[PDB]
Design an enzyme around this catalytic site. Structure first.
Site, PDB file in Angstrom:
ATOM      1  N   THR B  50       0.858  -1.104   0.135  1.00 39.92           N
ATOM      2  CA  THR B  50       0.074  -0.153  -0.043  1.00 39.92           C
ATOM      3  C   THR B  50       0.685   1.124  -0.019  1.00 39.92           C
ATOM      4  OG1 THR B  50      -1.801  -1.184   1.057  1.00 39.92           O
ATOM      5  CG2 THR B  50      -2.030   1.286   0.852  1.00 39.92           C
ATOM      6  N   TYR B 138       4.307 -12.454   5.244  1.00 39.49           N
ATOM      7  CA  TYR B 138       3.150 -11.769   4.715  1.00 39.49           C
ATOM      8  C   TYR B 138       2.717 -12.557   3.689  1.00 39.49           C
ATOM      9  CZ  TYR B 138       0.149  -7.981   2.647  1.00 39.49           C
ATOM     10  OH  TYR B 138      -1.001  -7.273   1.954  1.00 39.49           O
ATOM     11  N   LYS B 166       1.433 -11.596   8.998  1.00 35.70           N
ATOM     12  CA  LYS B 166       0.465 -10.776   8.364  1.00 35.70           C
ATOM     13  C   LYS B 166      -0.279 -11.812   7.361  1.00 35.70           C
ATOM     14  CE  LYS B 166      -0.723  -6.808   5.714  1.00 35.70           C
ATOM     15  NZ  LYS B 166      -0.417  -5.579   4.934  1.00 35.70           N
ATOM     16  N   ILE B 206      -2.835  -4.901  10.605  1.00 36.88           N
ATOM     17  CA  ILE B 206      -2.062  -4.312   9.567  1.00 36.88           C
ATOM     18  C   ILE B 206      -3.045  -3.639   8.500  1.00 36.88           C
ATOM     19  CG2 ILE B 206       0.128  -4.063   8.022  1.00 36.88           C
ATOM     20  CD1 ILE B 206       1.489  -6.342  10.155  1.00 36.88           C
TER      21      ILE B 206
END
Ligand SMILES: [Cl-]
Ligand SMILES: [Cl-]
Ligand SMILES: [Cl-]
Ligand SMILES: [Cl-]
Ligand SMILES: [Mg+2]
Ligand SMILES: [Mg+2]
Ligand SMILES: [Mg+2]
Ligand SMILES: [Mg+2]
EC number: 4.3.3.7
Lengths: 296, 295, 296, 295
Positions: B50, B138, B166, B206
């Protein structure tokens, strides 16, 4: 008002249909199973759903089963009859026949295989909902039916007085949460893997396959979550997780009938194209059931 | 090792602000980081997806990381995005982040090239080995095109530096078991599953929508952890339109357009990411009003 | 006026990037391989694509490999340079740098990982197409990139004078057939499994991985199809199927580097996170190679 | 066993005409069957998915089969759909079809209930054992929710009555190898893949758009068969809009609306299938014009 938890239940087993040695319907065993499952903590049962082998039983057998299960547990549990197929006319017949028997509610799966468009699903579900005065759950399971009930369809259907909730196996927890908030439809976890997530999102309870084997623990899971003891809820969800793993290997039909047998409740074997657990499968299942403390 | 203290409970997967000309805007990154922390984030992930990690240079990432450390590093945890589909580069990056004083690393599954699980394991291990920073895996197969399979996660768990995951894979059942077996901390890496992940024992979020609704997410975390699930559920519903907007726009387009709507201009995305169109801004503005984070 | 077959080729290898023992770029081996592949029947090569390990080589390394390859075979084969990443500005520099080296065309993959919207893809491919005068191929591979180039996006992009074709791994043969008919975009099979179906649908040829090992048979397969001997084309496609099966087990990078080694052309090992075949994987691949008659 | 001769090369997955009240319309079925054969089909599948097998009774399927056999059985091969997700029922239905004089069986993978591969194998074996009819497996996991895995198809190939596969699974690479290894005949079961399937050695098509464009599909088969791939490719393009309309409408809605548009009213689908809306008729009509199957 419509009290979904009272009218349909909080912990239901997507109950097997016991067959005899001769493979015929075994209603006496169905009565015994139904009693056992309620005694273990189910306050509802779904009869003649997918796990009840609805594909391979006749209308007559479904009605005999519902009759027997209603006689066995009808005064102390809610008995929801699986009433939909991929044939709208047939679903309406079955629905009416279930209502005539005294079913407490209906579970109506998305028409499978033929992939009707959303407007066909919507016309199908309202036609079934119009057929009786019974509360009705939609069963959204695109992984079996090959089409989802899309959120706009579910929302449109929500305004039907008889359509009161959703048994969800689609796992769109975000979408189901909003649907619930917006429409007041009740959700039941239709996938044991997502029982705890669904409760977090406000599901009313479970329509469970692993409840065949671990209903007492699932009841405790609901009680702990309900009283805000999430740590305990989480711990019980972990404790039953091997059953859900076994379910991935075997599917619910094979698992439920083999697991019940292992627990000393013979419910016979599945009808083709479903198959009984092999020796090695029974082995691996027994180890998971041990791990979940539902088998010595 | 206290994951909640060391890494945080509410982190924004923070955008990297660009100037009108497209160049890094560290001043605005500081201002944003301060805002997001003040709103209730106790950590930030910088230079993640992001944060447009694909389109920023190594130098930019380091510049941004330093700016954010300087702004909020005394009062919030700053985790740096550090992996790509290149092990050598990921190592370099992780080291450069550790040298800047990053508080932890977020290391995405190598994308695109679809290494086998043993390649993933060797990759994560090499990155984990490169610094003494705590590291999150992640797991986002929907972007990377390969999952970190549960066996691979479990094998990695015993790396002393690998402290959590994550998750954007949504395998709540599997994550739950991994947590129980390994003690790996989980962070919801997909706002749609924030609440389900908390139920499963995630440490926190997150978050992308935290750019716009950090305060409510904080309230959601507190309500949940205090034992008030009904209030947590309500808050989750309140912010849902933002997650809906995110499905329409993706996090990058949403976060930059929404911040602008809130009066915090963070510029526009870098190609192949794109700024929201006028129509999209309008539809985004409706969701943000619905979520009570605008007007 | 653009002759895609002549300008870009009909049989290309998605060529590995040889590395020395220390992992460094091995241009002498690249030049040897490029010559071998052309001598074996490829009339073009894609350098620094996915199978060339574009993720793990530097810009400098890509340019050095491109030069070595143009020098080796650029007078008698088409040399297409992979220039796309998930970063438009980078893709532009790469495209420019490849143009400056004399690349004969560009292969530009859908931005991966970051999932830009279709308008982002369109702006991206356009910007890259605008960067040089080179003919450019789109590489539609949603299975790696996590987003497709939707048909409308492909059609929009067809309207760029420099975008001349599609390397396809999406397998939407129906859609690609229509795109070809409507736009005159050339298609190259980008997945060896679909080489023959793609030719049926009017693909210009293959940008192949298994061509590392079986270029001569692929050349034969193209020729047989081209002369309308489909029975022979089908036979050859069956003959090389084990390589495609090996590729499913190993992935192209691992397969290509291990296979070339088995063939006596050592091209070193992959760079992490890619990995070299294990001795077992090598044995299994050898069996497949022998079945495909490309290993003794 | 000559599969092309015994089952055909161009078959329509034929609709089952219903009257205005929804009842079986056998006269129009016979009408429709004659028309499709005259247009170039050399076989028909009756009471398949497109034939609305889900919403017709056993009695209706038998009546329709009987009428279609009477109509064209002397000049075309009439294959009866006989599979459901119930093995005993499939067996009854296969037997009943054989007793009517069906020339072959099409048996779909049990849908919805997701039996394991060994359940599939026991199912298709039990159905194959039930009569002396040549039988096609219909591999369509996009409807049935499970594929017939290659090993299962290969195990089934050895059954003397199991002679081929109607494919909708689109694994051309695998089917190619299955054909090479087993001699199983393949039929394209998805019009999108007609031409690719021929390239891979498919015997022909069991087609939905043949309702509308049988003559061109015939011209396609012939052009391909004689080695004029260029013409086959052109024809496949010419009828593509019909396949596109099919993607919008599904085969049942498309076939019944399109036949009506051509002047062969075959009534409307049974719920949960639906008749085309006016806009859908317009859009379909435009494609049929494009495909030159409508003025
Ligand atoms: Cl939904
Ligand atoms: Cl996992
Ligand atoms: Cl396409
Ligand atoms: Cl297959
Ligand atoms: Mg309602
Ligand atoms: Mg660890
Ligand atoms: Mg063009
Ligand atoms: Mg056979």
């Amino acid at each position: 008002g419509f009290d979904v938890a009272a009218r349909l239940g909080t912990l239901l087993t997507a109950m097997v249909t016991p067959f005899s040695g001769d493979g015929s319907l075994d209603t006496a065993t169905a009565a015994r199973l139904a009693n056992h499952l309620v005694d273990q903590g189910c306050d509802g049962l779904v009869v003649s759903g997918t796990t009840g082998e609805s594909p391979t039983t006749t209308d007559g057998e479904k009605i005999e089963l519902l009759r027997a299960v209603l006689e066995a547990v009808g005064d102390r549990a809610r008995v929801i009859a699986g009433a939909g197929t991929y044939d709208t006319a047939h679903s309406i017949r079955l629905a009416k026949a279930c209502a005539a028997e005294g079913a407490h509610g209906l579970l109506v799966v998305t028409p499978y295989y033929s992939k009707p468009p959303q407007r066909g699903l919507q016309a199908h579900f309202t036609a079934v909902a119009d057929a009786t005065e019974l509360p009705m759950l939609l069963y959204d399971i695109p992984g079996r039916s090959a089409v989802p009930i899309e959120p706009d369809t579910i929302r449109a259907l929500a305004s039907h007085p008889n359509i009161v909730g959703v048994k969800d196996a689609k796992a769109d927890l975000h979408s189901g949460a909003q649907i619930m908030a917006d429409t007041g439809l009740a959700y039941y976890s239709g996938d044991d893997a997502l029982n705890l997530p669904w409760l977090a999102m406000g599901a009313t309870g479970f329509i469970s396959v692993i409840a065949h084997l671990a209903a007492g623990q699932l009841r405790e899971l609901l009680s702990a979550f309900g009283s805000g003891d999430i740590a305990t809820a989480r711990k019980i969800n972990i404790a039953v997780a091997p059953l859900c793993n076994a379910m991935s290997r075997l599917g619910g039909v094979t698992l439920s009938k083999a697991g019940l047998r292992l627990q000393g409740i013979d419910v016979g074997d599945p009808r083709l194209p479903q198959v009984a657990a092999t020796p090695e499968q029974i082995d691996a299942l027994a180890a998971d059931m041990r791990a979940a403390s539902v088998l010595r």
